[PDB]
């Protein structure tokens, strides 16, 4: 838990607050973090919660001092090694690549028929990010044309690549033309679709919104709850407490025409929220007895052949098993070759 706490410290440090630490003192406190970092005996676990914390920091563009992010990973790379910071290097490079990609896309737009909205997208990458497409969603009629346009731009530039859009992590801004004044709210894609459904009629039932947006039940219920919290959708019984109201697919929710919030920058997009090791050791010692002298890669391949057919173990676990078996003086390294083991019983 202490590693997690240190990593959350890191998160604050780099993320973003009302006060931005100067670049001089920002690296000063980062050096102190690395002073205690080497004292940490176990290094594998630190990368586990640092990956998801960093991914949320960058995908939402909530990171502060992205230059300090490059130096932070630079310090880590020389500390533990390339393999320990290989995944995080992909995350940073994807942000830099997509930032360049956005600039070229804007230039391509001017030379052709322009869009009707300011469109920006982070392309990310598959296999290196914890994100995955988990919620089905129907693309709104207003956010389709631009969609197609970008796909074309991503087909002429890159061939053989397929995009898998993540509407769960996509935000946006929506203007209004029917309120008392001109408002500009910020909401996720789900909330944008729900609020744009009311463009042609006044009141809809819950089922009429579920079958129009194809969002799953739990996420749709949560989005309706937060929208009701922002008093943007008004139920028939005003006096009923919103938290204890039980939602059913029969209530006729209508758009609140008389919305009169004083602030013109309403942000309703606020975020929410052992046994195997012995088996690997036995396989390693058996393979070492069968083959007296082996290389690290050949030993890994043999372990994968004999044992990975059962539960598909992770390579770092096997490497740690090799290290602990070395400490137990079960197999020794051979001088003259960095990766060579001899079964010394």
């Amino acid at each position: 838990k202490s590693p997690e706490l240190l990593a959350r410290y890191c998160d604050s440090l780099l993320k973003k607050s009302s006060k931005n630490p100067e670049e001089a003192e920002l690296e000063d406190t980062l050096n102190q973090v690395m002073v205690v970092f080497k004292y940490i005996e176990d290094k594998d676990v630190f990368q586990k919660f640092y990956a998801k914390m960093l991914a949320k920091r960058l995908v939402h563009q909530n990171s502060a001092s992205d230059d300090a992010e490059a130096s932070m990973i630079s310090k880590l790379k020389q500390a533990c090694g390339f393999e320990y910071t290989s995944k995080l290097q992909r995350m940073f490079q994807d942000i830099g690549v997509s930032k360049d990609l956005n600039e070229q896309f804007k230039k391509h737009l001017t030379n052709s028929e322009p869009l009707d909205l300011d469109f920006s997208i982070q392309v990310l990458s598959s296999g290196s990010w914890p994100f995955q497409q988990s919620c089905t969603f129907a693309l709104p009629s207003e956010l389709e044309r631009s969609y197609q346009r970008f796909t074309a731009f991503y087909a002429s530039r890159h061939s053989g690549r397929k995009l898998t859009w993540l509407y769960q992590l996509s935000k946006g801004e929506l203007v209004t033309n029917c309120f008392k004044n001109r408002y500009t709210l910020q909401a996720s894609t789900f909330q944008m679709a729900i609020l744009l459904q009311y463009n042609t009629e006044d009141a809809y039932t819950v089922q009429q919104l579920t079958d129009s947006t194809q969002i799953k039940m739990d996420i749709l219920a949560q989005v309706l709850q937060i929208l009701l919290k922002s008093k943007l959708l008004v139920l028939e019984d005003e006096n009923a407490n919103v938290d204890e109201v039980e939602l059913k697919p029969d209530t006729l929710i209508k758009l609140y025409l008389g919305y009169k919030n004083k602030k013109l920058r309403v942000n309703i997009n606020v975020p929410m929220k052992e046994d195997r090791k012995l088996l690997i050791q036995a396989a390693i010692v058996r393979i070492m007895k069968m083959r007296k002298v082996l290389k690290h890669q050949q030993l890994l391949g043999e372990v994968l052949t004999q044992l990975s057919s059962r539960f598909k173990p992770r390579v770092p676990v096997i490497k740690k098993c090799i290290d602990i078996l070395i400490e137990k003086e079960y197999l020794e390294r051979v001088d003259g070759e960095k990766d060579t083991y001899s079964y010394l019983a």
Partner: protein, 159 residues
């Protein structure tokens, strides 16, 4: 063939081929009392395994399949040669790379040797054998350790 081959075979008397099958107790006592292997260390250089002992050891080794098996071998010594006249299995249970002989082998050894002495087996245990199913014929670290242990106290012993 007459006189030429009459005494050339002489089935009544053991031939020069069957000479090794005769156990000389006095010579064995003399050689074990002299202990000529204590002065030198590359003393024994030849190991003469009988046909029956080799056949029994091979069949036992194959019977285990991919699991290791082990047993003892009776015999004697003569000059620089270790002669193995027989072999006998042990009731052990082992895995593909480890055989231990925990508690049933040690009673079986003594009881089998006592039973064999009753029906005219004058040879004593000369060695121990075990199988390496699929990784050559060599001595591992624990094999070397147990070979040292056997050799240091029971002086004539070959693995």
């Amino acid at each position: 063939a007459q006189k030429t081959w009459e005494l050339a075979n002489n089935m009544q008397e053991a031939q020069s081929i069957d000479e090794i099958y005769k156990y000389d107790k006095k010579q064995q006592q003399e050689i074990l009392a002299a202990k000529p292997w204590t002065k030198d260390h590359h003393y024994f250089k030849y190991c003469k395994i009988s046909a029956l002992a080799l056949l029994k050891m091979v069949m036992h080794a194959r019977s285990g399949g991919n699991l290791a098996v082990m047993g003892l071998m009776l015999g004697k010594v003569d000059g620089e040669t270790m002669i193995i006249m027989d072999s006998f299995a042990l009731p052990v249970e082992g895995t593909e790379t480890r055989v231990n002989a925990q508690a049933a082998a040690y009673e079986y050894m003594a009881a089998y040797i006592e039973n064999a002495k009753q029906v005219g087996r004058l040879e004593n245990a000369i060695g121990w054998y075990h199988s390496h199913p699929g990784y050559g014929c060599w001595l591992s670290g624990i094999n070397v350790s147990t070979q040292m242990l056997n050799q240091q106290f029971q002086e004539p012993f070959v693995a």
